[PDB]
Nucleic acid binder design. Sequence first.
RNA 1: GGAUAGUGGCCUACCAUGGUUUCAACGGGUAACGGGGAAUAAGGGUUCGAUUCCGGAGAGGGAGCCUGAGAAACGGCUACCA
RNA 2: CGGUAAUUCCAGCUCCAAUAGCGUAUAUUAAAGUUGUUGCAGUUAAAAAGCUCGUAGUUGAACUUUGGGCCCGGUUGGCCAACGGGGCCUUUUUUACUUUGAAAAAAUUAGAGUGUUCAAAGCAGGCGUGCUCGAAUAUAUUAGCAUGGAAUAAUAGAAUAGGACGUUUGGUUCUAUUUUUUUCUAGGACCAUCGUAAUGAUUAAUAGGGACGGUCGGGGGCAUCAGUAUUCAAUUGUCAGAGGUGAAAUUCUUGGAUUUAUUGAAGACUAACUACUGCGAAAGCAUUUGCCAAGGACGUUUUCAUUAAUCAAGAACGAAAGUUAGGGGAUCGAAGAUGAUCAGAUACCGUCGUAGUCUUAACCAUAAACUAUGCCGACUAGGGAUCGGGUGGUGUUUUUAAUGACCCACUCGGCACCUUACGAGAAAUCAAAGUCUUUGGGUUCUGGGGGGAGUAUGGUCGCAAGGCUGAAACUUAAAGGAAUUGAC
Lengths: 144, 129, 81, 23, 150
Amino acid sequence: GKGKPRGLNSARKLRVHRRNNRWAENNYKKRLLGTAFKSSPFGGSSHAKGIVLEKLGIESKQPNSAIRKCVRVQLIKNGKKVTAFVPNDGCLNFVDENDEVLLAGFGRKGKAKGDIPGVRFKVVKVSGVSLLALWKEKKEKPRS
Amino acid sequence: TRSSVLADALNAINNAEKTGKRQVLIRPSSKVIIKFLQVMQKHGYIGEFEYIDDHRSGKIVVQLNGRLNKCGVISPRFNVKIGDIEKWTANLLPARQFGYVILTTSAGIMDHEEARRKHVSGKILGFVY
Amino acid sequence: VLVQDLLHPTAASEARKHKLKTLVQGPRSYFLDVKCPGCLNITTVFSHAQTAVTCESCSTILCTPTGGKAKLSEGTSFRRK
Amino acid sequence: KPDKQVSKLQRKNKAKQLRAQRI
Amino acid sequence: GRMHSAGKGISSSAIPYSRNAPAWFKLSSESVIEQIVKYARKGLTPSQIGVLLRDAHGVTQARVITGNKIMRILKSNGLAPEIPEDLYYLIKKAVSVRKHLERNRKDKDAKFRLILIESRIHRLARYYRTVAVLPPNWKYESATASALVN
RNA sequence: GGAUAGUGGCCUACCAUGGUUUCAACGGGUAACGGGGAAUAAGGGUUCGAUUCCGGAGAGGGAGCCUGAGAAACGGCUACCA
RNA sequence: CGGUAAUUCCAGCUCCAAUAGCGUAUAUUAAAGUUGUUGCAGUUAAAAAGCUCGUAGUUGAACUUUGGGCCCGGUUGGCCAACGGGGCCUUUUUUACUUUGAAAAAAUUAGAGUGUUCAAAGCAGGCGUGCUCGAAUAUAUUAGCAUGGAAUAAUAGAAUAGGACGUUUGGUUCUAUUUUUUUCUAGGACCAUCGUAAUGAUUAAUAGGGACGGUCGGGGGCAUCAGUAUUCAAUUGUCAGAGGUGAAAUUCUUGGAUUUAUUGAAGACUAACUACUGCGAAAGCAUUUGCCAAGGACGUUUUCAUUAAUCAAGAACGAAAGUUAGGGGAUCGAAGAUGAUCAGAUACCGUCGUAGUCUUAACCAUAAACUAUGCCGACUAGGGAUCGGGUGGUGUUUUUAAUGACCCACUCGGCACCUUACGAGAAAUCAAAGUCUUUGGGUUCUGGGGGGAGUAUGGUCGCAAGGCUGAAACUUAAAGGAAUUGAC
């Protein structure tokens, strides 16, 4: 019964069978193939730094209605091109082209978050100062 | 293609007990079956039983008294070290203070409590409670 | 139903079961003494014979085979042995 | 058209010659 | 169940419980051993000999009247065949089917049945090599099998 | 037989045709130095170990060698490549 | 959530949580019985391969010293009771497995001692004011070593005896102390005769193979026979329409259509009987007779003696359509050529017709190839209908016996049905889809949210059409099953 061998000397078939079936687990397969090195923009790191190319607004998905604020960024270590979200409303005035920004993942392990189509990353720091400190008026940003 | 004569015998006893019958017949017999029943009889789970000769491995008729909850076989007969006996009893028995695991050892067939007094081990056969 | 004696079945119920399913197995065929009308020579015949058994004294035939029991010829006399 | 698998050597070589450009 | 079909039949002999000769039987053991050897010289197989003694004489079972089985009695007298009789009959059947197929190449059913017969030969011959009643490297093959039986 | 501190296709001459494998050889990959160990655990497990101790390898890349009980040494030498 | 009337945005009050700390990103562990040995799922939700054979692998029925007496006897409990152990009597080859022991560096881990002011630590420290206790112990898979046991699971032995004991009497051969070329003598092996013995072979599986007997079937191959019908053709009587649709037109016809009568040819097919019936591995199989070879079930006081179950590789067969070459070419008919384009039930119809439909010799290997349910084995359940075989009856009829047909009782095997639920399930429902948290009879295959996609790429098979094997980037919050109630 139960469709699997029970015999006392059947250990070889049991372990070989498990190896074949682990390839259906989604995160197991990612490790063993090394997908994060060969592809995806951060080559497996938690953060990356880039140069701002241009400023964009993204229309939210229906049923919500908003024009959300984003930037195009080129990553320094790869040259790959990416779009990032800028949190906290008026903070978009703190970023301008050829600024240098630090980016982080948008919390969903490579999926897009909420209303925003195709945006996977958010800005953390610009020109070496954190956006949270600027928004709360705790520090000042030098131009260049 | 009977792979285990012992497995068939205890399956027949379970099905009779569940429906409330007072007797059951099992075919064929073997030395191992007799030894297993004698242990069950010692602790009071079954009445007397009788063996019929036929020149062809015989038959047994068992009297049932309504005390048995379950009996069963473990297959394969895993090797058991003395330190392991405590794990099998935790998995198989319903409480710390009744029921038995049954072993074959080179000292004979016996329940797990006798094996501790004599300080022996071997291979697991089955359980009763 | 719930209580019955499995060791002492009644003779009548035992007689109707299939030969392999009685409490102990056993055959239900038997042997016959047979005499032809001519000779004195008795001979022994199996009740489910497959061969056409002749007499010993001469090539007169005593039985013929069928799908089951053998058919004894006309004029023969027999006794269950 | 065929899919290509990166051997250890050509993996090593490409990384080396990208470093040269940076330098 | 059957080895090569879905059949489930249970028909068989059922030998008696008693292991000693019936009270009405009264020939000697030597008498019946002489009969057995007599038929073997005439060319009958152990299966055929047993049938004749059962229904033309009183002999219920030769192993009970004498001490021994018919096959051993023949071997003790130099009458043993070169190959066992059940293997012999399988090869005989295969030859006759293979002959039929020489004329009737469209008979797809016969072609299927031939493969089953030959599987039974291999399974049986492998057994006899292990207990060494056949010599090692004895092998069935389609061409020579005809002469082996004939 | 030569060579070695010494055994051995370690190397040479003559001769034989062998050796491994579905109980996975051979080939490919590792963002792979091995182990004592670490994290999380009802039990059974899963993941990690460049890094305080033990063993191995290397001194930009390859090759060669002197002195010496001990090195194919690099805070010793010689040549080529960068 | 937010379109003024904001419990969710922004600010002010108040309140909550952790607190010298609190939040975010990425990886990994638990949650996850969503990787399942313990311990999942595969009728309808993802998932049983068209079918059968078969090598590696995994797994495999029962049986051989059992019982009974008599002493010693240690531990625990209140002399005596239980539990452990030894001795004696009664006819008295090779492995796996398990116990014990030696081994497995220190640090780390578990853990004994000790008021670092407590603690994380450390290995110290006490006592009179010279004296003195310590720096324990355990664990550590597998492999190797030594030792006790003999259940379970394997392996070997006496059958052309060539066997055992031989303590019975010859022969050959080889080594040597001692005490003196050679003998005695001690010890090797081998050959022969007498003699002793209970002289030496487990059962016969409601496992399997083989023989035999009377049967059974729309199972297969080759040959042969019949039946109407359809189309066409030749004769034949009569005289205007015939066909077809919802309606009509193209078409055929006074040289006679359609209709009637007598004959003939060709190719295909096998009505009614025909069913909750039969056979085959599946695909599938229906007129008669003959030949050839095969098969299940039943009967059996026949024979052999474990010969078995499932199965990667590998192999045979595989509807319809389709491909290559020859034959045939009635009917129907992808493509193609044509008639009408009017009318909402009859909205898709009429005419002609190529390939094909049949057959021979080679290919292809797909189907809702379905019971949408893998094979082998045991148990839980009862009744009378039917198909095949057997047994009994003082039974009916054919006839004065046998046989045949029928009736009643019983039994083995098969396609189904009705009743029943200890049970199972999300439910519909289920004699297995039961004997599963009270979780283990043996064994093969497949699945892991929905798309991208049976796509791309590599390989292999094919004349071709195509078959088999078979991804990822990226994208998304559902897609899906069963069963209730009932708007305009």
